Each structure stands twice: as C-alpha cells, then as structure tokens.
Design a protein around this nucleic acid. Structure first.
Lengths: 123, 105
DNA sequence: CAGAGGATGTGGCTTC
DNA sequence: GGAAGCCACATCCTCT
C-alpha cells in the first residue's frame, strides 16, 4: 500500500492484495485496469490463481480469462471479464484462490456490480 | 412500434409486392435479399436511420445466428434461413406459404 | 465486396 | 414519475 498508492485494496487475507475494481462495470466489457493479485509472502513463480465472482443472485457468475499465473509476487490477469450479471443494486464478491500447497483463499467483498449496460449516460 | 429486424423481413417476405428485392428460395424458410440496398433502404426507413445499409443490416442478422432465429446459408450471396419456428408463428408449412406467394422455385 | 464477430453507445420498454 | 435493468440494434472496425 505504498508504491502504487491508490492502485491496491486489501483482501480479507493478510498475505494478499488485489487491484481496485470499478464499482460498476458492463458485462463482457474489458476492465480499464488489468486485475492483479499481489502476494506479500513468498509465492513461487508459476503458481496459478483463479478468481470466482458471485453473490446472493449467482453463487457462481460466468467469467472469462479468470486464470492467471503468479510471476514475481504478482498475478497479472490478462483481460479478465465478468459475463454473468450481479443483480439490480447488488455486487459480486470475488473469491481469489492461490494454488500453492496447501492452497490459500482471499476474499474481496462487495467488489463490483455488473449489469448489461454498466455505467451509462443519463437519458 | 418496437419492430425487430427479423419480423420486418418476415413482413416483406409475406408481401408479394416486395418479391423483386427479397424473396423465398423455395427451400423451407430460406430466403434471399436479391436487392440488399433496397431492403436496407426500407429497413432504414422503418427505423428512421437514413444511413442504414446492407453492411449494417447484415450485422443485425449476424446477431441472430447465436440466438437461433436466423442462420446464414454458406456459399450463397445474400442468403439466409429462418431457423426458428415459423409454422407456429404463422400457421403455415413453408410449402403452403410458398404456394400463397406463388414462389417460383 | 461478402461475411464473422468484437467493441461501445443509444432507443424502447420494464422493474422497482 | 424516474433510476436502474434488459434487449436490440446502429455504427465502426479488424480479419478471413
């Protein structure tokens, strides 16, 4: 929480941080900032990282490119997208799984609302 | 009203006046836009989009492939096929419809 | 040119 | 009535 001041938020896990996500985005639209999961502790290069989104509307929301490999403490998710909607006025909770042995899981609560239109100009 | 592309085309295909620019091939629900520019012009007019053309209207149709409303007939220029259930919609087998319209082939 | 789809904003309508 | 959703294109573009 230093070198890229406002570029990282804390997850419910003291060993992981992830990029801040838009508060509301259009489904299947590319994120404006590549989602990254940053490992504080030592996480061997190559370690897989997946993210699952969902809430009381979708226990599981359809995503795209939801897998990334840990390279030098960081999992750089290439063009990650949210396909499944999160419901009117409701946001998804991301569950990040870092495939080490044993595996570790960090959570990002109420991280992002996804709708068919996403942020839109007033009518 | 909220007319949709496929519905609009279906209307033209069931109006014998429009047979010069759009018609059934004679094979089931397959049809052809013999004069794409004209069809596009009209579609443009019905939606109030003067700049409308075949290049954009065809994009409309391509969104249907996925939704199983209409598919492309590979190899045949300006040729598509309704893959949805028209009999249910207009209560006529293609053969009967082709007869009402005096569809040649 | 015809034809597949991707990207992104708008018009029409429906839900809360 | 009005914001927030959903669906259908309309436009533009990049490849094949």
């Amino acid at each position: 929480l230093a070198d890229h001041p406002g570029e990282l938020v804390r997850t419910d896990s003291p060993n992981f941080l992830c990029s801040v996500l838009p508060t509301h985005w259009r489904c299947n639209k590319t994120l404006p900032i590549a989602f990254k999961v940053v490992a504080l502790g030592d996480v061997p290069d190559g370690t897989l990282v997946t993210v699952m989104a969902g809430n009381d509307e979708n226990y599981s929301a359809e995503l795209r490119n939801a897998t990334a490999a840990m390279k030098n403490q960081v999992a750089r998710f290439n063009d990650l997208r949210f396909v499944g909607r999160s419901g009117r006025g409701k946001s998804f909770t991301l569950t990040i799984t870092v495939f080490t042995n044993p595996p570790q899981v960090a959570t990002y609560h109420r991280a992002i609302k996804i709708t068919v239109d996403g942020p839109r100009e007033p009518r | 009203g909220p007319i949709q592309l496929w519905q609009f085309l279906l209307e033209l295909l069931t109006d014998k006046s429009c047979q010069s620019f759009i018609s059934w091939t004679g094979d089931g629900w397959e049809f052809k836009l013999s004069d794409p520019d004209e069809v596009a012009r009209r579609w443009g007019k019905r939606k109030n989009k003067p700049k409308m053309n075949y290049e954009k209207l065809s994009r409309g149709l391509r969104y249907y492939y996925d939704k199983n409303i209409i598919h492309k007939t590979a190899g045949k220029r300006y040729v598509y096929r309704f893959v949805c259930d028209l009999q249910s919609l207009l209560g006529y087998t293609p053969e009967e419809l082709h007869a009402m319209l005096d569809v040649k082939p």
